Symmetry: D2
Subunit: 328 residues, 4 copies
């Protein structure tokens, strides 16, 4: 088994754990430790009861510095100092660092100093790492020597595979995206009741895209709003393409990719569905074919769904396996 | 005083009335009659309470066959045949048809035959009316012989003025729009039965065909989708267009900002404040450009996010259009 | 195997099918037919996709006037009159009439006449049926010759067991209830405002019908709030015997452990309404909220997934009816 | 004119100012000064824009240390030290302290020593202030010798007048209350959980507040509360046992009459079929919903009570303020 440690037990951290068990990936991966600067009581409770995902099916037990999920024992640490973590003693193959705040070499190297073989960040970090993976797109670029890696971000994993598919088919020359987020300072917007408004929020989506697709620097922008719905995101993508195209052809391309090389990663639907119907859906992206439009023959719009959190947590596990099982 | 009658007292009919008093337009226009099918105890209560900006500030009551707003008496009518509406007896200058159902030349003629000089429809109607007005964009296209006019639609009015501004400055080549609508058993459209509170729900939208009617040149160059989210009374419109001329986000904002100071004052507003949607609740502008959200990808793909209280701006535009029709008039 | 047909494929009828498969009761009940006025594609669709209960696990296909759940075929009918339902041909043991509109003795008689052996109504219905069952409280009042039975109402089901527990231990003198409803006609014409909306409720009438000694001693009100489909029931009773709040919690905790296990649950954990979504208990007593004013006025807060709990009790009462 | 200063410009302090301008009380009360740590530009923006109460009808400008409401200039302070507040300079007759921090006899003494003649706190406070006033019920218990006064709390202000009314008519023996809060505000494990889906139990000091005010109901009153995702209007579900025998129509008639007479402008009564937003920005402390009144047997009364907790409370602060500067 690949022995994994979770640094930080916020929403992504807890989701990685549930997804490990629910997906059957536990036959190949085991979680041996979680570091979180909060009490084990609350951790265990929040792991068992989720608003967005419901009741977790495995017995959850907490005792001393141990968290139990079914039979598995899991050490709970409260360390402010990354180098003082017991990674070597626990035989840590991969630390999944889910703390948020940027990722980087210094931090990865501190997990490695404590004795972890590799590090996978949940957040894009800086342009300094051994690699950034959008699983389903570029995991075959990983090498045995890539030890400090980033899995991109919740929102980037949703849209990148779609962008890849459209650009391969038609050549993207320009792109603009709006993300409609579900519910989840020097900004007079935070101190406003989320219950009733469409609230614009900061987004780093564009940076994510142009870092992954450097041929689009100065060619991509993004905005975002928050709305009071349940954990499903809609990404509204508008791209100009080189080759002329019609909507039913954009749709055929995406249907077949979901059928084929992107099965499990990008799904496609034509059914009359609403966002909750993708709650807890493990795909990175579900293209809603009913919303595909082409203006003229060069301006594509697609509406893409994702459970950004559940999709991403599953990909985190996919990337962890790819990292842990590569030959030099 | 411009004599008006309102046919249909649903959300829009009621908002037209509220707008008339709140805006001061009542110095210019008097509502002589309201035609509504369905009890009138309702009418008063809904006028009073279903408002969204506090209880309507004018005193409201229902006596006899009459509705009282403040000290004004309005004749309440219940008539199913357009032919027998007593517009002639009341000397009605414009009938504001707010039913959401009547929209054809023949419906127009039917109102005019019962004695209205002119008719204004609260929705796009048929493709062959005398004119379709987006107040602030093309009221000047109203001739004297145009007795049957459409006011376009709530959503259409939000966006066409920004489209005009953008087209004139940079030349729109193609365009795509997403409307984020606020909230309003078994049904053949399967999405409609679903709990609204929980979801982003894709909805059918007529916006593209509205843009297309107004801008003949944009046929086959414009598309639209929409979703409904569980927020209240303010719509956002997410507009992406390719333009001929090379532009930056800052120049697009200056343009729109200057236009809001000048020729679209009172119609299109502009802002750079960190505001949220409820901040435009009961705002009477047709559109509010949110400067902070403006992007240009490359130098030719503009994204603008526009807000509106779709019902409130529309109701106000109905009154504005009324006066212009009355202005140069048959 | 009990052969059941379902009349009305509204939310209730659909949860009855979902629950049938999820609890494993496929082993003792078979659904042989559904009558629904609307078309079978709509039915299959709604069965699969649900805002409250997520994606249904079993494969759902629709094919002509057949509906397929897993390997199972279910005839779909569109009869608007009870007399023409093919209950004889299909050998129906129990109609589960979930329409919310057929509830009288003569509606039961028309189901029987068409060949159904018995009928279980998914609502209080007529006041002159053979029995009204709130499972866990009075299924032992059931008899073989009871042919036209009512299953009470979802909200009645949530609270009646708790009322019985409290009346037995301390003697209820008077009672008053507020139901806080989720996404479940004077005020409907309003616009969207995200409001607490008062709604008419029949809970007082359901409580006194089940406990007639409470006539003129019980009242209830309700509000709708824009939440997910878990109801909170806020029950305030005056009682004869003096009590403290911790005594009340012990009694219900023990009730949950014992005679009401699987019907009433009990929690002292810091939960919120979504934590009871898809819970098949009729009621979950929240101990953290129990209060006693003085020593005689008890307040209890009780949670329920009113739809889910109720659809499972319908199944229980069904089995109890068929293999008597 | 009574000169007043406001200490703390959060939600309550801003609402007092809005309430002042909207009620016409600007003829009797002048706000000479606001002390607030945050920036003036922020104060102005938040005074102008508010999700509950909407766009302030009065112009709002901010320049330097001045906040302009209409054409009234108001002095802004940023002083952490009560001893240094320039009250004497400004001739402050009453400090409305709306910080929700300050609340003790000493804090009161500090304001007075800095030169404010009297003090009104916007909350419970501590158990030894000169008076606690729920305006409409006990403003008669005010004496000129009362210098350090508390206004009670929002919810306590909504329900006390009703309890008074029912106790006076019928003799209340015992009481229990559930408060249905909208989106407003031992580690509470529920506070993580997203407001947008659930009914969420929350701690309440309502009973404490009632006990404090009516110590004869010591051991005779309890309260729970929940939060639901509605906008700014609270429902209070009050269930009391009474000594006298009563009927629901008699209860409603009592309360309707009190609303016509002795509690006019403080308690309102309605028989109309309404919803909670209908009371948004309603200045009464309480609106009894007559459609919802019940009595079980002849002694167990339920009434459902609405209030815009923040707006009624803002208006009461001013009522008390006015009763504190005039004892002549």
């Amino acid at each position: 088994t690949v022995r994994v440690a979770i640094n930080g037990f916020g929403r992504i951290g807890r989701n990685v754990v549930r997804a490990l068990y629910e997906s059957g990936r536990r036959a190949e991966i085991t979680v041996v430790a979680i570091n979180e600067l909060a009490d084990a009581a609350g951790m265990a409770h929040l792991l068992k009861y989720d608003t967005s995902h419901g009741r977790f099916a495995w017995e959850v037990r907490q005792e001393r510095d141990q968290l139990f999920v079914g039979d598995d024992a899991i050490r709970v640490l409260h360390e402010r100092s990354l180098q003082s973590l017991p990674w070597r003693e626990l035989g840590v193959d991969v630390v999944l660092d889910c703390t948020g705040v940027y990722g980087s070499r210094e931090h990865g190297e501190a997990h490695i100093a404590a004795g972890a073989k590799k590090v996978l960040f949940s957040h894009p970090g800086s342009n300094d790492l051994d690699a950034t993976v959008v699983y389903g797109v570029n995991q075959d670029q990983l090498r045995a020597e890539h030890r400090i890696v980033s899995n991109a971000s919740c929102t980037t994993n949703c849209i990148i595979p779609v962008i890849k598919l459209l650009d391969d088919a038609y050549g993207i020359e320009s792109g603009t995206v709006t993300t409609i987020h579900s519910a989840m300072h020097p900004d007079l917007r935070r101190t406003r009741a989320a219950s009733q408004s469409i609230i614009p929020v900061d987004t780093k989506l564009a940076a994510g895209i142009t870092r992954f697709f450097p041929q689009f620097n100065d060619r991509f922008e993004a905005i975002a709003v928050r709305v009071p719905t349940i954990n499903v995101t809609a990404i509204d993508l508008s791209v100009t393409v080189k080759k002329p195209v019609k909507a039913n052809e954009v749709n055929l391309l995406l249907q077949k990719a979901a059928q084929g090389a992107f099965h499990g990663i990008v799904d496609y639907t034509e059914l009359p569905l609403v966002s909750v119907d993708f709650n807890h859906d493990p795909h990175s992206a579900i293209v809603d074919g009913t919303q595909t439009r082409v203006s003229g023959a060069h301006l594509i719009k697609t509406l893409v769904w994702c459970d950004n959190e559940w999709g991403f947590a599953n990909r985190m596990l996919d990337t962890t396996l790819a990292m842990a099982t590569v030959a030099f």
